[PDB]
Scaffold this active site. Structure first.
Site, PDB file in Angstrom:
ATOM      1  N   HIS A  41     -26.805   3.472  24.188  1.00  0.00           N
ATOM      2  CA  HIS A  41     -26.159   3.139  22.930  1.00  0.00           C
ATOM      3  C   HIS A  41     -25.473   1.776  22.958  1.00  0.00           C
ATOM      4  O   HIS A  41     -24.902   1.331  21.954  1.00  0.00           O
ATOM      5  CB  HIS A  41     -25.210   4.270  22.476  1.00  0.00           C
ATOM      6  CG  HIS A  41     -23.865   4.269  23.133  1.00  0.00           C
ATOM      7  ND1 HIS A  41     -23.382   5.356  23.833  1.00  0.00           N
ATOM      8  CD2 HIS A  41     -22.870   3.351  23.131  1.00  0.00           C
ATOM      9  CE1 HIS A  41     -22.146   5.107  24.231  1.00  0.00           C
ATOM     10  NE2 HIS A  41     -21.813   3.898  23.818  1.00  0.00           N
ATOM     11  N   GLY A 143     -14.559   1.468  25.625  1.00  0.00           N
ATOM     12  CA  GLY A 143     -15.079   0.665  26.716  1.00  0.00           C
ATOM     13  C   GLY A 143     -15.183   1.473  27.993  1.00  0.00           C
ATOM     14  O   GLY A 143     -15.637   0.962  29.020  1.00  0.00           O
ATOM     15  N   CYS A 145     -17.020   4.152  28.198  1.00  0.00           N
ATOM     16  CA  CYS A 145     -18.384   4.677  28.262  1.00  0.00           C
ATOM     17  C   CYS A 145     -19.038   4.025  29.467  1.00  0.00           C
ATOM     18  O   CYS A 145     -18.759   2.868  29.769  1.00  0.00           O
ATOM     19  CB  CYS A 145     -19.190   4.300  27.015  1.00  0.00           C
ATOM     20  SG  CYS A 145     -18.526   4.901  25.474  1.00  0.00           S
TER      21      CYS A 145
END
Lengths: 301, 301
Positions: A41, A143, A145
């Site tokens: 993503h 951030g 992720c």
């Protein structure tokens, strides 16, 4: 805390964390050998997320579209491909700090450590568990992720999780390192909802044995029970049903404590049916379910 | 856990852990440059511990009396001296993994991460706090002595603790890296007793702000208070008294949450005087005091 939650030493994983940027999106990546893994993503814009067509979004990208930075050094991506929900970025430099490692898919209820990172640099290490409904409890910032979950087996790092998204309820969802989501979740910002969660009975039992190991057995009684009678009570209080495999797993703890597994189950049963009445266990007022029998044995030996 | 306790990444400290043996006694040591630091009680036998005369016990020792092993490699001790309650062992090899570091003495209530090791190898990382009565809560096993506590400031490791002993009550006592004990304790196996402990008010307030930061302010009320009125309540419930310095420290959290410090104190006051009534805060049923205002800001930013 009479019994502290313990994370694995993070050194081996720290040397693998990098930053990957694509447009306004920046997140964490895992650099092993000459490959950087990160949530796919990263190629999506806030709008793409509503309903992304990844194969199509990826076609519009090129190697020069990904900015990978390991510390202060920019790495050169010489290839990009999709592996389920992960983006596999081939780089021109092999990570000199790559440890011995394996990719493993854990089962619900199992635990692991998470090296939370932001913009490519390690922030802290947390110990957690995969909930029965396939989500993770905690608090991840923008951030975060890309941070990974892992277990260490002597000198081998077993990676088992990579964080992808925060569900509207605030719980977290992610994949294994083969890019396969844990649970029914997908990487799309939709109404997705996690199934109702339950308490990890096996872990609660392991923790009760731990409490006994450290002299604190006020909860133990003279009764016993069976898998059928206990599971009836379990169904009532939203506790995972106990299986024979679970009983067999608790054997080592049973043998060393002098408490038969079904006898500990009889103690748990009473606690659910009556409560703790102000009384505490291991400096805790609620039944802890984030310690597996393996964690208890490991932390006690 | 709505708000997880977080440890600092341990990589920089892992490369500094070694094993030091002297007779039947084996414990952990910290190898920085060409010096290995470890509890001086490593030279004591179970009997010496009842009433040790260290200067005298040390005279009977020689460099060849200490067996230092870093991983699988034995290091050669070329000198030994005593620094307060620490044994300073000079070795012939400088640690190639020595990080940038400092020795710091923390104050009661401050937090730090502990890299628990056994027989020279890292086992896990725990986050904890220095209790007001100068002890540490947790569970350390035989051979855990020598493990260190630390904080990381960007790229610098600030060592602040080294574990030495378990008091009869099961609580832990240790020193800073200059070998000075925290508290009135000494490294002798006597009747020693720690002063009655209290709750770290400043940290409880920081945690309440954290709970608000993550949407959970049912405990907030329309009242306010003052340092005198709050401390009266604090004295009643065995909570550390609040000082102006503490209020000033909570400013950043106050500014960003929209809750004046004395207003949060008014909320805490009510919780102590009434209780939580089943209601919970950050998935907790008791007031958490092991998060400093700095930990909260760091974990939120």
């Amino acid at each position: 805390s009479g019994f502290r939650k313990m994370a694995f030493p993070s050194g081996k994983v720290e040397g693998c964390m990098v930053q990957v940027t694509c447009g306004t999106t920046t997140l964490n990546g895992l650099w092993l050998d000459d490959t950087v893994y990160c949530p796919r993503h990263v190629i999506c814009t806030a709008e793409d997320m509503l309903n992304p067509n990844y194969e199509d979004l990826l076609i519009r990208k090129s190697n020069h579209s990904f900015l990978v930075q390991a510390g202060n050094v920019q790495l050169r991506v010489i290839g990009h491909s999709m592996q389920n929900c992960l983006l596999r970025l081939k780089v021109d430099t092999s990570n000199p700090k790559t440890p011995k490692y394996k990719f493993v898919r854990i089962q619900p209820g199992q635990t692991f450590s998470v090296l939370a990172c932001y913009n490519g640099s390690p922030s802290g290490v947390y110990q957690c568990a995969m909930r029965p409904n396939h989500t993770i409890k905690g608090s991840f910032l923008n951030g975060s992720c890309g941070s990974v979950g892992f277990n260490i087996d002597y000198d081998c790092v077993s990676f088992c999780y990579m964080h992808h998204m925060e569900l509207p309820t605030g719980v977290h969802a992610g994949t294994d390192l083969e890019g396969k989501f844990y649970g029914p979740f997908v990487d799309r910002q939709t109404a997705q909802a996690a199934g109702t969660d339950t308490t990890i009975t096996l872990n609660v039992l392991a923790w009760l044995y731990a409490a006994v190991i450290n002299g604190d057995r006020w909860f133990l009684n003279r009764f016993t029970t069976t898998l059928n009678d206990f599971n009836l009570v379990a169904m009532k209080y939203n506790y995972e049903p106990l299986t024979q495999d679970h009983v067999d797993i608790l054997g080592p703890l049973s043998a060393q404590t002098g408490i038969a597994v079904l006898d500990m189950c009889a103690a748990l049963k009473e606690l659910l049916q009556n409560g703790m009445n102000g009384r505490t266990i291991l400096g805790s007022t609620i039944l802890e379910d984030e310690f597996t029998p393996f964690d208890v044995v490991r932390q006690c030996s």
